[PDB]
Design a protein around this ligand. Sequence first.
Ligand SMILES: [Ca+2]
Length: 787
Amino acid sequence: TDQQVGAKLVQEIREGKRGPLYAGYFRTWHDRASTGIDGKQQHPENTMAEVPKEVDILFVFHDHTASDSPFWSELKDSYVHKLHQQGTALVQTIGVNELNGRTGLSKDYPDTPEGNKALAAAIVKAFVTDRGVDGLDIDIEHEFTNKRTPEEDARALNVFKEIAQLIGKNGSDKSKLLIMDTTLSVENNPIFKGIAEDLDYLLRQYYGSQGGEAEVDTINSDWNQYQNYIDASQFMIGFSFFEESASKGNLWFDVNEYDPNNPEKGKDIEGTRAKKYAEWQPSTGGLKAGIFSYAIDRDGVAHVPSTYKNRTSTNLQRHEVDNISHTDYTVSRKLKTLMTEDKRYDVIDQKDIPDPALREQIIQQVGQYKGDLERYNKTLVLTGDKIQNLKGLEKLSKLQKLELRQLSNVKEITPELLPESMKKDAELVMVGMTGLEKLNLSGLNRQTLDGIDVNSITHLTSFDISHNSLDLSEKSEDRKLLMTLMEQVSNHQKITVKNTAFENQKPKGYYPQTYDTKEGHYDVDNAEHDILTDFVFGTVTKRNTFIGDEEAFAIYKEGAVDGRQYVSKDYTYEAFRKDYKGYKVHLTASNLGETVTSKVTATTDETYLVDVSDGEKVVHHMKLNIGSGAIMMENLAKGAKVIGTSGDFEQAKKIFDGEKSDRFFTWGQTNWIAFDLGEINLAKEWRLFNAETNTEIKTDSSLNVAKGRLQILKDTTIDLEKMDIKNRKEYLSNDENWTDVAQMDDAKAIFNSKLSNVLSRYWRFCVDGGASSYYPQYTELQILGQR
Ligand SMILES: [Ca+2]
């Protein structure tokens, strides 16, 4: 039957037995069996039956064909049969709107777990099972007018995962393909991220130029992201043939332009983007799966000339290439043989990897093709007693982790059996290397000997870990492992500088993860001190060996093992040390005033809270005393209850929260807020954050308060819970009931001044005028003191 031929075909594609693929989108209304809603045939010139063997997968791209057209029968009972005989699979294409509630069967089903599971079944039955084809393809493009809701995308993904339980690799019916095609980068494609593991292929349309001098920038940029979700052998890129009467916005120039001097110019692939795409390969991961064309029915038609690039549906500029004509699929076949002749898809053979057991495990993990070797960039795990030689492993030059497990019969590890990425900090794990006799890692800039099981290298006769970046100082763990290596050599041979090389190390420097001083101190010497130089300084090696200054580095360079000095002679402190380029120091004085400076001048008793930042995070926090210090003040006002104001009562309370993300002003040049601190405590200073302090809206200094008065309630005995709202407000507005404690007369961003040990529970702040004509604003008010 052609259900068992279909299954056999799909299983040979999914397991990668056809090399590079070529696929095509056939527009149903350009098949001669297609009829419109009228019942009239649309175009007799072409047919899917004629699609050659070189096309590996044919995508049914449906539009204009009516549902009662003879085409659907011709597809199911004739076309699929003929194409299966030459090894070609049929895949049905549907848009994502059939999945998210906007079109077709998705309007008839609720957005619930059982509803979406019934929708999935109805889709697989209507678009795969009943059409006779071998798989489904979901089209997810950008929606220019009327974007998709997060609820529609969350639905499309849930339906997609239920389809993937029915068909595809992770489905009940493994005989069908499950494909996605898209125009969306990973960042903009939540459905892809959720459905990737269940995909056979991702077909990413790249019609027209994609930026840069090679016209392929967006392809490389996107593969850099896509590679974290799918394998290269699942990635296909697409070009478009020239659609008839295509307008501006749909003119890609992916094939050659019309030539009046050469009618066959359209089927010449030299110079075309189609050819560039056939040749393009990923930088990482592996080799791609192949390429596909849109509108394969237009294969070989020359593209409309560049001078037509501006035609619209309103501004017709019809050309001879707008005609419909029969195609012999010449461009398709040339591009397919161009890809199968690509000598990068030759299988890895004994010439590349001589050891058969090594070659089996590389092929299992890296892929089949010679071109997969220089691209693979993940992990390789080599095990067992059958591997004798590691020749050929230097071809995996982008490997990120090499893991050697129980390689009992491997006698040699040398830098020329190792990938190039071992020189740029790739991980290397070795366990149970009981047969290893030569261990040469020279010149690979290795920062650690971590992961090398030195205890099990029991047959070692020589090693060379010279010219690396190792810390071999007394307390370093790498010196302990160096020692074991030297003892394993001693069992078999007299130690020599040649057979235990470890000199010329150049260990790189790092920032310490912490700093010792939680509490610093200066005397009151009337001098400037640098907080960075005194407390937050120095560098560490990878094994956390501290070096404080240039002299400590000089002592480090003279470290030796058995009188053999291991650090390179011309390695300089400037090269090892960390400059502290981005570093800033955030100080909070005892009156809660904030400044950003590394320098302090020790003139009086004071306490700072210090927060050091590197430009991103806080790296250190300490307290610093000058002299006897000073007790850290509290903001008495924080959370003060507002008891009355000339402005809006709910705007007023936002000058007593934590933030500067708000503003209080009135319809005028003057206002007052009166507030209650709860209890009565002792107040030594006040601080006002003016208008230009504002964090939610950039405010210029013309809106600043210029004159103002902070005040306490004259009567200490007064109880104002007794008088009622109308009297209370009039009482709190009468200025003869308050005494000036502080007077502002300058429009500074932050205004601070001292009080004379004010003990009061009721307060009022009056704005008496602004910096300009505009209504003066301010964001936060602070009364500073104890308890
Ligand atoms: Ca505030």
